[PDB]
């Protein structure tokens, strides 16, 4: 029912303090299920969701060996990037990598991702067509030419279309309800007097999963986009998310204001008024 699997890699060079740190987190949808850290006392892939702990030592050992080879690859990537940007040996640099696959309810590949950022800027990304690259700058074009020449896109596309989707398939089988269940938001409106003439209506969504949500204020059916304060969606700490939207309303116009909550946990959106 529209699921995705993503790996987020961070490699950080530290020229004084030894070799580079490699960390990985793996996600099914908005659920973190594995982690790896090269700075762990005995670096091993570790479960971060209950439904993955059923996998045996072979799972953890195999993945650990892969992260080790990935860390090494990233070390070489960081070295090349230093040269592309004529950077000094003294500076610490960051390579962030993200790859994964989005599948429809048919469980076949809807969208594939494979993208990199160097020192927190876009570097290179595989296009939706999984057949071409977007380079952010002239350095990233050096990488583009290499990968174009060596036809590594075809390889990537085949991984994304095949293996990625089969691992996702397996994880959904193991997850069952933990991953297929959309938890609708718990909603309420609070009233915050500003002066005797004005109050802030704050519309709340809590305990929702997944993270994707739309919160909007309407005045007599018309959208108040430019006059609505909206916090970034935030983790609650229990694998649920929170968000709120706030609008400043004149005294005695409260009932003109409707808060609208869209979430896949809701068959149809909720309309809330201050009560």
């Amino acid at each position: 029912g529209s699921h995705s699997m993503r790996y987020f890699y961070t490699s950080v060079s530290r020229p004084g303090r030894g070799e580079p740190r490699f960390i990985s987190v793996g996600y099914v949808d908005d659920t973190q299920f594995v982690r790896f850290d090269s700075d762990a006392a005995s670096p091993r892939e570790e479960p971060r969701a209950p439904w993955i702990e059923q996998e045996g030592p072979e799972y953890w050992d195999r993945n650990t060996q892969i992260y080790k080879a990935q860390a090494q690859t990233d070390r070489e990537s960081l070295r090349n990037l230093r040269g592309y940007y004529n950077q000094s040996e003294a500076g610490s640099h960051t390579l962030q990598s993200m790859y994964g696959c989005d599948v429809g309810p048919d469980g076949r590949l809807l969208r594939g991702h494979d993208q990199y950022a160097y020192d927190g800027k876009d570097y290179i990304a595989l296009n939706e067509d999984l057949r071409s690259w977007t380079a952010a700058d002239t350095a990233a074009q050096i990488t583009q030419r290499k990968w174009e020449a060596a036809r590594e896109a075809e390889q990537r596309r085949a991984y994304l279309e095949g293996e990625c989707v089969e691992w996702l398939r397996r994880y959904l089988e193991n997850g069952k309800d933990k991953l297929e269940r959309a938890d609708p938001p718990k909603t309420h409106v609070t009233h915050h007097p500003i002066s005797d003439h004005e109050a802030t209506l704050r519309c709340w969504a809590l305990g929702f999963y997944p993270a994707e949500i739309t919160l909007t204020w309407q005045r007599d059916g018309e959208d108040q986009t430019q006059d609505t304060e909206l916090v970034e969606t935030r983790p609650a700490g229990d694998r649920t998310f929170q968000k709120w939207a706030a609008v400043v309303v004149p005294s005695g116009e409260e009932q003109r204001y409707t808060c609208h909550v869209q979430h896949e946990g809701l068959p149809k959106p909720l309309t809330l008024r201050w009560e």
Partner: peptide, 9 residues
């Protein structure tokens, strides 16, 4: 599981 193909930038 993480992919076991590796590509140098």
């Amino acid at each position: 599981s993480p992919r076991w193909y590796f590509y140098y930038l």
